[PDB]
Design an enzyme around this catalytic site. Structure first.
Site, PDB file in Angstrom:
ATOM      1  N   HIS A  43       0.669  -1.119  -0.435  1.00 40.03           N
ATOM      2  CA  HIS A  43       0.324   0.070  -0.124  1.00 40.03           C
ATOM      3  C   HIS A  43       1.245   1.268   0.309  1.00 40.03           C
ATOM      4  CE1 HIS A  43       0.680   0.530   4.677  1.00 40.03           C
ATOM      5  NE2 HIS A  43       0.350   1.850   4.166  1.00 40.03           N
ATOM      6  N   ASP A  95      -0.528  -7.753   2.497  1.00 39.56           N
ATOM      7  CA  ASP A  95       0.212  -5.990   1.919  1.00 39.56           C
ATOM      8  C   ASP A  95       1.793  -6.140   2.153  1.00 39.56           C
ATOM      9  OD1 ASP A  95       0.783  -3.597   1.914  1.00 39.56           O
ATOM     10  OD2 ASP A  95      -0.446  -3.189   3.553  1.00 39.56           O
ATOM     11  N   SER A 201       4.429   2.541   8.079  1.00 36.76           N
ATOM     12  CA  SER A 201       3.711   1.215   7.207  1.00 36.76           C
ATOM     13  C   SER A 201       5.406   1.350   6.667  1.00 36.76           C
ATOM     14  CB  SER A 201       3.035   2.193   6.647  1.00 36.76           C
ATOM     15  OG  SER A 201       1.925   2.333   6.838  1.00 36.76           O
TER      16      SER A 201
HETATM   17  O1  LIG Z   1      -4.207   1.878   7.988  1.00 38.75           O
HETATM   18  C1  LIG Z   1      -2.935   3.113   8.252  1.00 38.75           C
HETATM   19  C2  LIG Z   1      -1.822   3.440   6.499  1.00 38.75           C
HETATM   20  C3  LIG Z   1      -2.543   3.045   5.506  1.00 38.75           C
HETATM   21  S1  LIG Z   1      -3.596   4.104   5.263  1.00 38.75           S
HETATM   22  C4  LIG Z   1      -4.955   4.048   3.284  1.00 38.75           C
HETATM   23  C5  LIG Z   1      -5.783   2.787   3.593  1.00 38.75           C
HETATM   24  C6  LIG Z   1      -5.368   1.593   3.528  1.00 38.75           C
HETATM   25  C7  LIG Z   1      -6.996   0.349   3.969  1.00 38.75           C
HETATM   26  C8  LIG Z   1      -7.900   1.345   4.007  1.00 38.75           C
HETATM   27  C9  LIG Z   1      -7.906   2.385   4.304  1.00 38.75           C
HETATM   28  C10 LIG Z   1      -6.976   3.285   3.813  1.00 38.75           C
HETATM   29  C11 LIG Z   1      -9.779   0.291   4.333  1.00 38.75           C
HETATM   30  S2  LIG Z   1      -8.525  -1.184   4.417  1.00 38.75           S
HETATM   31  C12 LIG Z   1      -7.443  -1.570   5.645  1.00 38.75           C
HETATM   32  C13 LIG Z   1      -7.959  -0.914   6.950  1.00 38.75           C
HETATM   33  C14 LIG Z   1      -6.628   0.788   6.902  1.00 38.75           C
HETATM   34  C15 LIG Z   1      -7.330   1.264   8.274  1.00 38.75           C
HETATM   35  N1  LIG Z   1      -6.640   2.716   8.095  1.00 38.75           N
HETATM   36  C16 LIG Z   1      -6.473   3.585   7.924  1.00 38.75           C
HETATM   37  O2  LIG Z   1      -8.311   4.019   7.599  1.00 38.75           O
HETATM   38  C17 LIG Z   1      -6.770   5.334   8.320  1.00 38.75           C
HETATM   39  C18 LIG Z   1      -6.752   6.196   7.704  1.00 38.75           C
HETATM   40  C19 LIG Z   1      -5.624   7.392   6.823  1.00 38.75           C
HETATM   41  C20 LIG Z   1      -5.635   7.647   8.199  1.00 38.75           C
HETATM   42  N2  LIG Z   1      -4.452   6.273   8.913  1.00 38.75           N
HETATM   43  C21 LIG Z   1      -6.221   5.613   9.043  1.00 38.75           C
HETATM   44  C22 LIG Z   1      -3.194   6.143   9.468  1.00 38.75           C
HETATM   45  O3  LIG Z   1      -2.466   7.168   9.054  1.00 38.75           O
HETATM   46  C23 LIG Z   1      -2.836   5.193   9.757  1.00 38.75           C
HETATM   47  C24 LIG Z   1      -1.411   5.190   9.406  1.00 38.75           C
HETATM   48  C25 LIG Z   1      -1.074   3.385  10.444  1.00 38.75           C
HETATM   49  C26 LIG Z   1       0.140   2.633   9.492  1.00 38.75           C
HETATM   50  C27 LIG Z   1       0.135   1.167  10.414  1.00 38.75           C
HETATM   51  C28 LIG Z   1      -0.107   0.669  11.439  1.00 38.75           C
HETATM   52 CL1  LIG Z   1       0.722  -0.287  12.436  1.00 38.75          CL
HETATM   53  C29 LIG Z   1      -0.560   1.978  12.199  1.00 38.75           C
HETATM   54  C30 LIG Z   1      -1.299   3.530  11.531  1.00 38.75           C
HETATM   55  N3  LIG Z   1      -3.419   3.175   9.277  1.00 38.75           N
END
Ligand SMILES: O=C1CCSCc2ccc(cc2)CSC/C=C/CNC(=O)[C@H]2CCCN(C2)C(=O)[C@H](Cc2ccc(Cl)cc2)N1
Ligand SMILES: *[C@@H]1O[C@H](CO)[C@@H](O[C@@H]2O[C@H](CO)[C@@H](O)[C@H](O)[C@H]2NC(C)=O)[C@H](O)[C@H]1NC(C)=O
Lengths: 253, 28
Positions: A43, A95, A201
């Site tokens: 991602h 991922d 990430s």
């Molecule tokens: O997932 C993330 C980053 C991927 S973001 C792209 C995305 C992919 C898939 C999806 C939603 C969004 C939908 S399925 C997988 C679920 C993902 C849930 N997440 C969100 O919705 C984010 C939304 C943005 C703010 N936000 C949270 C972040 O910045 C963090 C950063 C982070 C990374 C790793 C860890 Cl261990 C802890 C925190 N979380």
């Protein structure tokens, strides 16, 4: 890394920074698993819902130590490899991404690869209550008022987190989790805290084998609903469960 | 790799980082 702390010099020499070339911007973490092979989260590279789609030429990685002579090493990528069955559409299952360097990197005091686990190691550690380590250059707070508060780090951050039981993982979130991911973090009861955050990430979750003193990358920092929120846990790509795909890519190219 | 996961400035010098014992202690 929220609620972590400063890593010492050379404490994590498999650490890799993924950068976008233009405009120059830190993007993600990665890990060095050989002289020419680098491990990250899919991602970081591909998320269509957000218009993220990068190719080898859009990126460079940064490896090693970050007056002092600049001993940091910049390198280009030959090829990206996103897992074929990476589920960006639903839950970020699988991922995982591999990046081959244009030319191999020379190990040193600051540059050294981490071990991928084997069956015995993964089964022997990677149990609930056991602690792994997460490292990154990602944010220190989930939100911060810009210019009034510190959010981005100056040195590599580290936090040790316990693996959580799968049932506790499943119940913590409405996202459909798979055997291809595990979760870590302290429960609200447990006193301690800490977590991955934006910018962490793709970086490694490592454990030290008491059996041979080597560091194994058990996870990849994948996703989390917030950073360091009570009742919530960070999710990690289960590296061993995806090792067959890692082998397939390296052995064939 | 044959020497992977052994850090030049720690394991190879017989030094421990600040927080690694916390990992080992979690296995006990
Ligand atoms: O997932 C993330 C980053 C991927 S973001 C792209 C995305 C992919 C898939 C999806 C939603 C969004 C939908 S399925 C997988 C679920 C993902 C849930 N997440 C969100 O919705 C984010 C939304 C943005 C703010 N936000 C949270 C972040 O910045 C963090 C950063 C982070 C990374 C790793 C860890 Cl261990 C802890 C925190 N979380
Ligand atoms: C994201 O990466 C590229 C965008 O640059 C898309 O790849 C294009 O289409 C096919 C897909 O099989 C590639 O083989 C071509 O090399 C690309 N075209 C051009 C103009 O270079 C890719 O498919 C996008 N991924 C997703 C999931 O949409």
């Amino acid at each position: 890394i929220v609620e972590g702390s400063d890593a010492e010099i050379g404490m994590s020499p498999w650490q890799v920074m993924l950068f976008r070339k233009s405009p120059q911007e830190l993007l993600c973490g990665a890990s060095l698993i050989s002289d020419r092979w680098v491990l990250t989260a899919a991602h970081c590279l591909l998320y269509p819902p957000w218009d993220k789609n990068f190719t080898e030429n859009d990126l460079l990685v940064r490896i090693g130590k970050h007056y002092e002579r600049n001993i940091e090493k910049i390198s280009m990528l030959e090829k990206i490899y996103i897992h074929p069955r990476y589920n960006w559409r639903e839950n970020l299952d699988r991922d995982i991404a591999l990046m081959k360097l244009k030319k191999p990197v020379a190990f040193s005091d600051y540059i050294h690869p981490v071990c991928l686990p084997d069956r015995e190691t993964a089964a022997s550690l990677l149990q609930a209550g056991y602690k792994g380590r997460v490292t990154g250059w990602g944010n220190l707070k989930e939100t911060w008022t810009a210019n009034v508060g510190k959010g981005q780090p100056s040195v590599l951050q580290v936090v040790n987190l316990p693996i959580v039981e799968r049932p506790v993982c499943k119940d913590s979130t409405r996202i459909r989790i798979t055997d291809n991911m595990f979760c870590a973090g302290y429960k609200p009861d447990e006193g301690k805290r800490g977590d991955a955050c934006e910018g962490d990430s793709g970086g490694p979750f490592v454990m030290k084998s008491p059996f041979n003193n080597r560091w194994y990358q058990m996870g990849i920092v994948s996703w989390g609903e917030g950073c360091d929120r009570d009742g919530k846990y960070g999710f990690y790509t289960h590296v061993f469960r995806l090792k067959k795909w890692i082998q397939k890519v390296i052995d064939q190219f | 790799e044959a020497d992977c996961g052994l850090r030049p400035l720690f394991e190879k010098k017989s030094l421990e980082d600040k927080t690694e014992r916390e990992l080992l202690e979690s296995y006990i």
